[PDB]
């Protein structure tokens, strides 16, 4: 019944920069506000309680202010390990306790080209009847990359999947894994397999390939 609103929705800032997040209440909630941090794939973590009190064990660069309807979280000097999603929460109108929608924070760094590796299907996997080809990109920035499969120079489509890692907590880079799946039949019909990568840090598309024999 109390609506909590956060701003901005997402943001990207450099190490050492100041990050400012605002949380607004639909009606006075005195100092009944808390701030949480949720790094991806892990449980939230209390940072500030009672609007401006630093939970023990939280870096001193975190701080909060406000009362009534306006509150503000501040990271005085952003650090590489602070990439996360930040939530505010209200503890005045019980029930129900209400959260904000969240604010995603990313670390900005310098462009970095990816290292590329390709892997053929294992003979063990092939006797079972399916062939999976894999293509890995390591330590690149920004996140935007485009992987591209070719079998005998014929472009593939709708037969591959991929996933991307979180930002590394020291160097702020990303990595990516992509998998081309074919039937054992189709795999031994063609010979040359390749993944072609496109990224800002590459002045020209990079290709990695192997031949079915060797």
């Amino acid at each position: 019944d109390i609506q909590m609103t956060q701003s901005p929705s997402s943001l990207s800032a450099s190490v050492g920069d100041r990050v400012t997040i605002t949380c607004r209440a639909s009606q006075s909630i005195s100092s009944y506000l808390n701030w949480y941090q949720q790094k991806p794939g892990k449980a939230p973590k209390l940072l500030i309680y009672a609007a401006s009190s630093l939970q023990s064990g939280v870096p001193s660069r975190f701080s909060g202010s406000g009362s009534g309807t306006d509150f503000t979280l501040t990271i005085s000097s952003l650090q590489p390990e602070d990439f996360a999603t930040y939530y505010c929460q209200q503890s005045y109108s019980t029930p129900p306790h209400t959260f904000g929608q969240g604010t995603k924070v990313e670390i900005k760094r310098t462009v970095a080209a990816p290292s590329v590796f390709i892997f053929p299907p294992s003979d063990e996997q092939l006797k079972s009847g399916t062939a999976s080809v894999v293509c890995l990109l390591n330590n690149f920035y920004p996140r935007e990359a485009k992987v591209q499969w070719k079998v005998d120079n014929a472009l593939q489509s709708g037969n591959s999947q991929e996933s991307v890692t979180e930002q590394d907590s020291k160097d702020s880079t990303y990595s990516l894994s992509s998998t081309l799946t074919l039937s054992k039949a189709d795999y031994e019909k063609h010979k040359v397999y390749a993944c072609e990568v496109t990224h800002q840090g590459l002045s020209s598309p990079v290709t990695k390939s192997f031949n079915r024999g060797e």
Binding site: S31, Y32, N34, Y36, Q38, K42, A43, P44, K45, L46, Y49, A50, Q55, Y87, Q89, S91, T94, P95, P96, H97, T98, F99, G100, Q101, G102, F117, I118, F119, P120, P121, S122, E124, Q125, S132, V134, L136, N138, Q161, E162, S163, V164, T165, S175, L176, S177, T179, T181, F210, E214
Partner: protein, 217 residues
């Protein structure tokens, strides 16, 4: 050393019943409330309910009242979250958290989470395959055909020591099953000047842990 530890991942079919657990340690379980929070896949946090383990007085959210039930067992210092007929909408992550009631309330300690997956599928353990390249060499491991998506990787040398150059990629869904990969980087020198010709990939999963040797070219 405050600590809340929850039950493992689950796979249930629409209409079944389920009970999750959340056990506390390192503090008097009966001096703090226990709250449950839900996070739909890819969305934010939603407050579900409370229980005071001292007297078991519960307070639910209007959204969830009726469809879910909260209980506790202070003798074993544990709290529970229960469904009677599970629905597809209930597929999400569920967190328990210790709550303070003295003055301004706050959730000061959280559990690791329980993944609840509601589908027509049936659980299965992963199947492992090695990944070998056809001044540092890369070697990997591929897991396939497992459900739920609750998997962990680890590597070991031939001398059962630990390899710390691990790399973790999210899973992907395909025909009701998940697949994932992992890679490691090894110094080019150390391998040539060496008598080890393999390394060991390990995965942990609710329905079965499994190992697989990986050749070194």
């Amino acid at each position: 050393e405050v600590q809340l530890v929850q039950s493992g991942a689950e796979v249930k079919k629409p209409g079944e019943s389920l009970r999750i657990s959340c056990k506390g340690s390192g503090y008097s379980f009966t001096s703090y409330w226990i709250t449950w929070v839900r996070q739909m896949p890819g969305k934010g946090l939603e407050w579900m309910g409370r229980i005071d383990p001292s007297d078991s007085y519960t307070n639910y959210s209007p959204s969830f009242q009726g469809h879910v039930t909260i209980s506790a067992d202070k003798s074993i210092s544990t709290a529970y979250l229960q469904w009677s007929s599970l629905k597809a909408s209930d597929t999400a992550m569920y967190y328990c958290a210790r709550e303070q009631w003295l003055g301004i309330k706050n959730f000061d300690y959280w559990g690791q989470g329980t993944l609840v997956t509601v589908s027509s599928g049936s659980a299965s353990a992963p199947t492992l395959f090695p990944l070998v390249s056809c001044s540092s060499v890369a070697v990997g491991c591929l897991a396939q055909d497992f459900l739920p998506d609750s998997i962990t990787f680890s590597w070991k040398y031939k001398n059962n020591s630990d390899i710390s150059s691990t790399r973790g990629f999210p899973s992907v869904l395909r025909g009701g099953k998940y697949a994932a990969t992992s890679q490691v980087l090894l110094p080019s020198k150390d391998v040539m000047q060496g008598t080890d010709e393999h390394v060991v990939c390990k995965v942990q999963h609710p329905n079965g842990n499994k190992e697989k040797n990986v050749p070194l070219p």
